[PDB]
Amino acid sequence: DDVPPRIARAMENEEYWDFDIFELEAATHNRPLIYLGLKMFARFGICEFLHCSESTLRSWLQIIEANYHSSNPYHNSTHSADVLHATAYFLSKERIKETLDPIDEVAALIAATIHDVDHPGRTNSFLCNAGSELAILYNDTAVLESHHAALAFQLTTGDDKCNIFKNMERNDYRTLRQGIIDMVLATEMTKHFEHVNKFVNSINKPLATLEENGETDKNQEVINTMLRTPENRTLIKRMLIKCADVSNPCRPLQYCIEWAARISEEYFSQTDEEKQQGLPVVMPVFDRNTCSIPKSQISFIDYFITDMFDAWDAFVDLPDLMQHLDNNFKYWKGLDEM
């Protein structure tokens, strides 16, 4: 379609992992999700599955991207575009093609687009302690994560032109709705170790056991049967959206550092607001006046990222991501210089 040249060049090598998302951000004028969305939805053929026009998809991507806050350093349209790029990369790998169905691919790419819609640059704990409208609305239980999915479906189905699910069947939409909701809710922080351990115990450990008896067609069909079940497909979806969300430590060094600055700046603004209003300081280490960003990223990678992407790597085979992870980890160590 008639896209401008810089934005067209910015989306040149979108199938590759090494991708300049900030050049696309700069080119699109903080509209990376609509341009990258139209291409990624067309490549997979999502409107052919959903039975929507291109005009419906443009209106859908605009109203959602509009509700992403530009004022937030990290949690904005450019993050979800990078998370959409991470999702599309994992779907394009052979393990995920063989395992997941086309309905899961549509559920994954839609979930990534909406997963932080109307993020206020503030955590769940902030809104619970502050007594926010959403914290009261969702009863201190997945305050942001429930609001993201809910508002997304309010904006989609509430308007006629925005609704991309209008021509679906009753059964197909119900499954896809439950798929997207689950993947959006899976990104909440407190269920990290629940969703990671389930992926190890139900997929990786059984798959490691099944690999002992050669590479026979009888054993390969049992691996095909075991992975493709509805329960295991859900656990892969929960793991894929979680890895796609926090893929920034496994990006190229230039992009990794930029994501680290934005998330840190966002937490410093929260900590300044927590002290000013007199709220309890839930994230004490993330203060601009005391935080070491290199050391904090090392702590962040060790706690959450290292074990998660190790499990995800064994399943999918991601030598580029783990090579970047090692390169970025060694960089943060090198910045001490004392």
Ligand SMILES: CC(C)Oc1cc(Cn2cnc3c(N)nc(Cl)nc32)cc(OCC(F)F)c1
């Ligand atoms: C306490 C706080 C730092 O914990 C977090 C923060 C985040 C959000 N987040 C996303 N990219 C991040 C990054 N590069 N550094 C930091 Cl410090 N937090 C990041 C995700 C997460 O876990 C992954 C999933 F559970 F959400 C856990």
Ligand SMILES: [Mg+2]
């Ligand atoms: Mg989130």
Ligand SMILES: [Zn+2]
């Ligand atoms: Zn996110």
